[PDB]
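tool_call predict_complex ligand=zinc ion
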Amino acid sequence: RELQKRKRRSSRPTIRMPNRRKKALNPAGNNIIAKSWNKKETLSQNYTRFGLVAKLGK
Amino acid sequence: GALKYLEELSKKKQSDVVRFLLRVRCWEYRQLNVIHRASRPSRPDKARRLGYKAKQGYVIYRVRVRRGGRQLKYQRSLRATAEERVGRRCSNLRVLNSYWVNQDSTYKYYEVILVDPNHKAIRRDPRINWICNPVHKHRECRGLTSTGKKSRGLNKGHRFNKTRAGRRKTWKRHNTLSLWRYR
Amino acid sequence: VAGLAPYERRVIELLRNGKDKRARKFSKKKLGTFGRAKRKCEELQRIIAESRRAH
Amino acid sequence: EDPYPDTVEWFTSVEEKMPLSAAPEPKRRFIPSKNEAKQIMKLVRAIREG
Amino acid sequence: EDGDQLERELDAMYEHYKERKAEAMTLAHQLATGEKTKADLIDEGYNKYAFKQKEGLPDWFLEDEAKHDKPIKPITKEAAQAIKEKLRAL
Amino acid sequence: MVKWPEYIRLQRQKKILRMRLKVPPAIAQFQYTLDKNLAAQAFKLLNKYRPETKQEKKERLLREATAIKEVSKKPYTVKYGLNHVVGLIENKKASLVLIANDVDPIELVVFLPALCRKMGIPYAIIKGKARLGTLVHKKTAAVVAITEVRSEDKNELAKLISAVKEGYLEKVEDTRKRWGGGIMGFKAQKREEKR
Amino acid sequence: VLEKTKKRLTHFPQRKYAVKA
Amino acid sequence: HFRKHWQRRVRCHFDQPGKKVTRRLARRAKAAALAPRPVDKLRPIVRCPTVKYNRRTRLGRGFTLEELKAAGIPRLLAPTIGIAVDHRRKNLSEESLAANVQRLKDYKARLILFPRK
Amino acid sequence: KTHGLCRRCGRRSLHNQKKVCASCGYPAAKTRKYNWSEKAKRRKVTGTGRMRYLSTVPRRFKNGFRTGVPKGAR
RNA sequence: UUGACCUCGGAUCAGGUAGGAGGACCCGCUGAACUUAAGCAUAUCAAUAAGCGGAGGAAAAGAAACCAACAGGGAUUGCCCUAGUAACGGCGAGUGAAGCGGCAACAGCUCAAAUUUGAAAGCUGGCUUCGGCCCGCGUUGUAAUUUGGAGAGGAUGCUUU
RNA sequence: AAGCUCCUUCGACGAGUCGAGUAGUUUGGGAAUGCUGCUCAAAAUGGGAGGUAAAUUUCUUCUAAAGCUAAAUACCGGCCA
RNA sequence: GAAUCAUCGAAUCUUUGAACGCACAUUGCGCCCGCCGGUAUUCCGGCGGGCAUGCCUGUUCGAGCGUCAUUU
Ligand SMILES: [Zn+2]
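tool_result ok
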């Protein structure tokens, strides 16, 4: 709390962090799946369009 | 085969020759200090099966600890106490393991196998870089050695229902009042 | 190469003297289980027999 | 009771005529050494590279 | 050769350093009362410290072994009373 | 009077203890060491079969590599190593066994003379793991085995085997099933009489 | 990485495939 | 049953949609990594142990060695094409063995395998 | 005067006779911190000072601990 | 006389390491009392609060000396349910799980036990023209092979780098 | 170097540790629920845990005393949003 | 190429504090290596590099009738 208030009072810039995630949310590359992937659609819809089975489980 | 023969000796440790050897070595240990350095183990077969390696960075330390009651019994084993004393002695090394080596009417004697995390042979060896990793700092203090697991009851079965996944964590999980959005 | 423990040698003496019941009772008292007592009497008995053959 | 008795060699009195293990001897004990073969090859590589 | 001189020096130094610096009654009670017999007494006497060399060994090492070869056996208040009455002098 | 260092005092006390204590038969037969002539002859044969050192081994490897740039038989050499020698004895590939008398974990050896005896391979106990480590090009070795040698020294190998298996084996075989020690001195005798 | 695991990943690598609908 | 401090040991569920979308993003990330491959490995058909659920069947941990051999898929190559292998399980019945063999054969018939590099 | 100046915490809490500070315990390496005084914890917790280096770490983490210079720099 | 081997020490020798902080979550040690039972002592509070030691971004646990009596399941972990059931209890107050089932996630492995013995094939340091030269560790065992729903060795003929 | 198939050849598997008696602590759990302390102290057609009145301990299922390991999980703390 | 600018990969970083040559309540007192100025090979003052502990590896030195030998 005192640490946050010290950042309030100090004339030091706030170190904003970028939205970096460990795993890419979309495939990338010069392959068929990457070229035909639709970013807005979800995984199930993309696999429906591709014609492949997404989940082998029940 | 020699290690198998040594294992059989350690099995029949109450025999005449082993009793004589433990007598002489007990006298020697009483004469030495409470904590001291061994370059070579007293029981090489036991050290090898516990993981001691003939490498630069592996050391044995022999430690004597007072035995008896603490009628309140000290829940930490003498093995764990010896490992912890070794940790405070050489905080730089990592406690690989420990094994009983001798006992007396006042002191019990243990030998601890320790590994150096800053030596690049240990860094290179991919079977020991796991203890080179920083998660294993003071395993003896966190009860992560064999004595720690035995005292924490980290075993499978209905006999270990309360401790297989952590005593305090199990208590907290059973005593949390979970309330969902749609009750 | 190693030899015998004090209790093992005691049971050996009992078996050589012929007090099989006394040896069995002493072995049970030292070990804690009837099966272990019987087994230990067995190894000690074959040790006695082998020593007799060797002599 | 004699405290410290002479040991009777009940088991070792019989000399055993035959080796313990029946595992067949591998070929490496009758063929020359591939370890030195690979070492010689590496040395030849080094000599060729100078 | 025989080590007699070196043993003499060690014993003299040990003597100079020394200069510079209920269980039995419980067993007697157990034998008297109909609890433990002769065979039980020898059975309990076969301890881990049985056949302890005591005549040919140096005095200092024998004293150390005597200090550290004491087994803890249960005691009784009756034995404590008996030993107190025995030790009570005129 | 004068005060001795702790480790020196402890070390002399340890030798006094070893010479005073009643010794079990294994450590007793360890105490019983062979004679100078047998040791010297065995060392002569072992030196004629000492293992190749690293310098000349790399030299011969380079020899072979250059030969490849611009035909042998099995090497016969003395075998060293506790596990290797005990396995060799178990497989009865050993012709003679030499054992260091001063292995400071003594359990590493306690069973070795007995297993040699039962197997049948002749064995002897020599003074100096240092000499074992100098026979090999190391600092110390626990056991040394001779399995097979070349043609020229079949005769002297057999003669050394017979010499040891008679003149050390029977000599320390008549008396090896007892307990050693009993070297009490004058002060020890007086102390025991007073006790 | 260990030699055994290196050989295993060399000779039996993760394959890239698809399951038809 | 409020003898203890449920005040200090009450934990709520206001993050349910957040965890749901996080799980969806995690499986989407796995799909992006294994872009042509299915997200989950194939699993065998096993039977519920207890008497109350005998007539019902579910998914197991991994396929049996005998089932893999009968289906003609090598043990070392099955995990690389996405078949869970369980060394602990045993068949003990021709019915279950045949069912898992048929499942593996269907997987083979529906699978397309790419030629290494 | 019972208490004097303390080297570590800078307050007049160093007991003269015992030579031990009542606030931080100067002879002891560890600084005194008791969980039953949350007000003391918030008084002597991090953030009440100047943060010579802990205020410079986060920018380095954001930039990825890069070492070197931008290309074409005098 | 000399030189080893072993052990024990010194050096303001060379290279590193341990403190402390933080402690919301985590792993251990140690551990109360108020209260309830309309009095109170077992019990409860509570294997909690305070105190002590030790890490990380998660920790811990983890690939059965398991569950089970099955037509079997098959590392660990978290939710729902099992369930206020079983079981225990001044059988008062009360305490109180677990298997199974539906899910989320799913990944398996390294050793000791063997003789490379037709060749310590392994590794530390300093010296570098940075390519390869020594020193030391080590046979009281460092590489390769192997870890029990396995494996080794030969023969054998396919297929992979 | 590696995976396999076959076999008139082999197949080592963790000890003051299990276990017995006993004091303390702990749990819903004297088949001691688990652990610790003391005394004694193991086995190799072995050991552990279960099933069962079914007629004798038949049957079932696993290998303890060495070790590593991401993910689903918690988060009044740190950098932010 | 301004800015009480933003970014920030490069520097400076006084005394204390886990606090580390000894002392600490003195800007005090020490020892080794080098330099500087003021009569200066000697005197004085200042400055730079340094000097905590336990442990690991390596190097060097030392001790031990512990111990091996060594006439071919
Ligand atoms: Zn202060």
